[PDB]
Design a protein around this ligand. Structure first.
Ligand code: CAZ
Length: 354
């Protein structure tokens, strides 16, 4: 059983050389141990203006934004507004291209739609460009054949998922997920009064923030603090005291297993592997692989490693938890650094907290 000092000594002994080796300017880390968050901060949120990382510092979550997407989508399922078996064209009729018949919300939500591009092109800047973009996309595989990770599929899923509620994605995410969970420092658009807490990302030694883009809120655009992300991991790990019945089940649905791709199972936003597992088995994510459908989706199991990585131009994020142990970690950095380094550091910390 670890004391808070033993936790701090473990986390520092991993993060301190990591930040020097990767030249990370600032990091915020939360460990969930026995269900309780422990907070750690090092370095600068802004090097030139000498602003330290605090527990309020806002980091670009990058693709960890897709976990908020999944939970809001699972919430919509629980409300009865959508079903994953529903066709895409139900919620966007102007998608009359014959290639869209047979594509369901399930596919956009789990990257199995047949091969949408990784990013929405920079050319696309309004509804017309975006509708034209999807209308003229030619699939590479039949729906459900392969998993190909992308922003453009789960990004569209989140925008369509919220149409029954009659609410925008930002508004729905705020009303149905952020506010009920008390995530008061998690933003799609950082308010004026919070700009000063918005850390700068660093790429090649220069400060950068990500630029807006079509479907950015749904795929990569959430900013948040280490305290909120600790609460976000807490709630996804154990929603047993979430009061909203639909949000509680949405969290459960997001950790259901919808597809098997080797040793990994695709949730809604979240990804899972069986626990316990070797570090090397987490350490080709950008490759298209055959997807085996799990139908019905298998309910969540405690003995899993639930995680999501995210990156922007100037930030690297990683969150991971193992529900069987009430154990989890949030890793926020204002520099993008290699994915296997995050996994290895997360594993090293959580392996000593057994
Ligand atoms: C390789 C991908 C595919 S896109 C996806 C996504 C979510 O984090 N990232 C972006 O959309 C993104 N950059 O991705 C990389 C890291 C590939 C990049 O091009 O920098 C981005 C969004 S706004 C911004 N600035 N950058 N994640 C990753 C990852 O594994 O880090």
């Amino acid at each position: 059983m670890k004391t808070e000092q033993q936790i701090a000594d473990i986390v520092n002994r991993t993060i301190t050389p990591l930040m020097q080796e990767q030249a990370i300017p600032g990091m915020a880390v939360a460990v969930i141990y026995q269900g309780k968050p422990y907070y750690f901060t090092w370095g600068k949120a802004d090097i030139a203006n000498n602003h330290p990382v605090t527990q309020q510092t806002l980091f670009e979550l990058g693709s960890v934004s897709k976990t908020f997407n999944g939970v809001l989508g699972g919430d919509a399922i629980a409300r009865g507004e959508i079903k994953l078996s529903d066709p895409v064209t139900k919620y966007w009729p102007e998608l009359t291209g014959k290639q869209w018949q047979g594509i369901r919300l399930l596919h956009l939500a789990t990257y199995t739609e047949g091969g949408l591009p990784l990013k929405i092109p920079d050319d696309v800047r309004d509804k017309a460009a975006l509708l034209h973009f999807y209308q003229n996309w030619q699939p590479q595989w039949t729906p459900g054949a392969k998993r190909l990770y992308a922003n453009s599929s789960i990004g569209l899923f989140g925008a369509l998922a919220v149409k029954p509620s009659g609410m925008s994605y930002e508004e729905a995410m705020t009303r149905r997920v952020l506010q009920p969970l008390k995530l008061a420092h998690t933003w799609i658009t950082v308010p004026q009064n919070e700009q000063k807490d918005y850390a700068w990302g660093y790429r090649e030694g220069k400060p950068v923030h990500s630029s807006p883009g079509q479907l950015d809120a749904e795929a990569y655009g959430v900013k948040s603090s280490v305290i909120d992300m600790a609460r976000w991991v807490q709630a996804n790990m154990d929603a047993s005291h979430v009061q909203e019945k639909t949000l509680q089940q949405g969290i459960a649905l997001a950790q259901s297993r919808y597809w098997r791709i080797g040793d990994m199972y695709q949730g809604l936003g979240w990804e899972m592997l069986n626990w316990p597992l070797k570090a090397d088995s987490i350490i080709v994510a950008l490759a298209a692989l055959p997807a085996v459908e799990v139908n019905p989706p298998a309910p969540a199991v405690k003995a899993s490693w639930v995680h999501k990585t995210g990156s922007t131009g100037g930030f690297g994020s990683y969150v991971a938890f193992v529900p069987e142990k009430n154990l989890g970690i949030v890793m926020l950095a204002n520099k993008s650094y290699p994915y296997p380094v995050r996994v290895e550091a997360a594993w090293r910390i959580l392996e000593k907290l057994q």
